[PDB]
């Protein structure tokens, strides 16, 4: 079945936020409700406030400030890398992590930027695998 | 660790599917970001339209609409049983169905006008239990 008896008693659905997840995605594809543009140097990436908020320490704090939860642009530091700032965009809607050899550093900063600390943490495991 | 790889051969995380609903719910329930109020009958419950539309056939094809999609107050069926309607927001938000013998029909019949299939399912599958 696609649902079991969780701890608490209660039937819990196994693949509902994943389904969920790739809903929200499909929504960014077709830019569906979509409430914000994050500027990154010459790149524009539209996305869900909610969405950010719940994967970024950076995005909560913004979108939880009276000022700025009501901005339509975000603009980020301009030293932070458009490819490094996409893959993690992905990730948040994804779950999956496009790490590559040429990208990690990247990454990286892009997320301890972004406050992703799970992330960040990935991406000190794998660099430590190399040297 | 909290991932693996992939079938693609991308790293992918076990748990961000449901620690980005885990978020998501605790942004509703501190009342940030919310766009939108669901009526039914004399209550009130305030939601985000992305999740709404991520889980039900009726919210997307709402909010998806040219004309409906900017509303911030949705009326539904007044024959609608709010306690129905509570039990299955609270399901979206959380993969959990607080499904009882006492509530089984409402939330069964909320789940068939919200266009919410798989709960649907179960729901007709745990009547035939009993029967
Ligand atoms: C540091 N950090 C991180 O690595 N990730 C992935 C983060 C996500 C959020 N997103 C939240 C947090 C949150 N609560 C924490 C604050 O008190 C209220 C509940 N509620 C909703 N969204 C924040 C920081 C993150
Ligand atoms: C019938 N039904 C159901 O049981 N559940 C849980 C449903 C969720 C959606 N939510 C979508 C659907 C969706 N795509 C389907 C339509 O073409 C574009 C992609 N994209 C985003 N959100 C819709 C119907 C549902």
Redesign the pocket.
């Known amino acids: 079945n696609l649902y079991f008896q969780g701890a608490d008693s209660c039937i819990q659905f196994t693949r509902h936020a994943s389904d969920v997840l790739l809903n929200l995605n499909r929504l960014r594809s077709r830019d569906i409700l979509t409430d914000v543009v994050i500027v990154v140097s010459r790149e524009q990436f539209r996305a869900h406030k909610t969405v950010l908020?719940?994967?970024?320490?950076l995005f909560?704090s913004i979108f939880t400030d009276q000022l700025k939860c009501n901005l339509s642009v975000i603009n980020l530091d301009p030293e932070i890398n458009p490819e490094g700032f996409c893959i993690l965009l992905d990730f948040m809607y994804t779950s999956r992590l496009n790490l590559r050899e040429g990208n990690i550093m990247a990454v990286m900063a892009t997320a301890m930027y972004l406050?992703?600390?799970?992330v960040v943490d990935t991406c000190r495991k794998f660099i430590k695998a190399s040297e």
């Open positions: 908020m719940a994967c970024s320490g909560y406050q992703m600390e799970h």
